[PDB]
C-alpha cells in the first residue's frame, strides 16, 4: 500500500470509530466527505479547522450544546476542513417524513455534488448515507465501512 | 497593523473568549503556548490537530468527559498543534495546597520551558497562568489579556 492508500485507511478508521460511538450514544451528526466536486462555497460558511482527522475530534465536534455541533462537518481528503457548515436542504419526497434537518441537508448537498454524507440520528441512533440524491438508512457498521472503502 | 500583528490579536481574542466561557461554566482547561523552547516531545504525546485556532474549537476540545479534554492543548505557530497532551507535574512545594494536577502540570511545564500556560479551575472557574515556575492566580480578564499581549 502506498502512503496515500494508508492515509485513506486511517481516515476511514477514524470516521467509522467516531460514527459508531455517536450512533451508540444517539449523538446527532452530519459529516460530508468532499469528492471530486469542490465544496469550497459550503466549507466557507463554517468555522475553519483545517485539522488532522481523528475519531476524538470528530466526536467532540458533535457533542450536543457545544459551539461546533450544529451544521455539517466537511472533510477534504485527510482533513476536517470546517465544522458547523451550511448545506442546502433537499425537497426530495423520498426522505422519510419523520427525519429532520440533518438528513434533508445531507440529501441536499448530495444532489449538487458527488460527495458522500454520513448522518447519525439523534432520535434513533441510526446511521444513514446520502449520495447522488438518495438516502440509504439503517446501515450496519460493516455496510458503512464498505461504502467508505468503495468511495 | 501588519498581517502578523492582526493574526496574533485574533488568536488572543479567540483564547480569551474560550477561557471566559470555560471560567463561567467551571470547565477545567489546560492550554500551553509554546514559545522559544521547543515542545515537540510533549506535542507528540497528544492527539494531533494542527488546526486553526478558534474559540469554538477550544471550547469543543475541553468539554468534560469527552475524548480530548484529558490533558493539555499545546499551541505552536498560531495553531492548535495537539490536544490531550502530557505535561510534567511540578514538585514545587510553593503551589497553593488546594490546587490539583492541572495546575501542577502547568507549573511543571513552566519550570522547563519559556512557555505560557493558562489554567481554568474546575472547582472555582478561576483563571491562572503558569510561567517561569510560578502560578499567577485569580486573574481578571484584563490581567490575562495583558499577559498574552506581553508574551
Ligand atoms: C474514549 O472515549 C470513547 C470514545 C470517544 N472519543 N472521544 C469521545 N468524546 O469519546
Ligand atoms: Mg434497510
Residue numbers in the entry:
A (entry chain B), B (entry chain A): 102 to 252
Q: What do the authors report?
A:
The enzyme CdaA, which synthesizes an essential second messenger cyclic di-AMP (c-di-AMP) in many pathogenic bacteria, has emerged as a promising candidate for the development of novel antibiotics. Additionally, c-di-AMP regulates the bacterial stringent response, further underscoring its significance. The synthesis of c-di-AMP is mediated by enzymes possessing a diadenylate-cyclase (DAC) domain.
Consequently, we selected B. subtilis CdaA for the fragment-screening campaign due to the excellent diffraction properties, high reproducibility and quality of BsCdaA crystals. Notably, these crystals tolerated up to 20% DMSO in the reservoir solution, which facilitates soaking experiments. A crystallographic fragment screen of BsCdaA utilizing the F2X-Entry Screen resulted in a 33% hit rate, identifying 24 distinct fragments interacting with BsCdaA across eight sites.
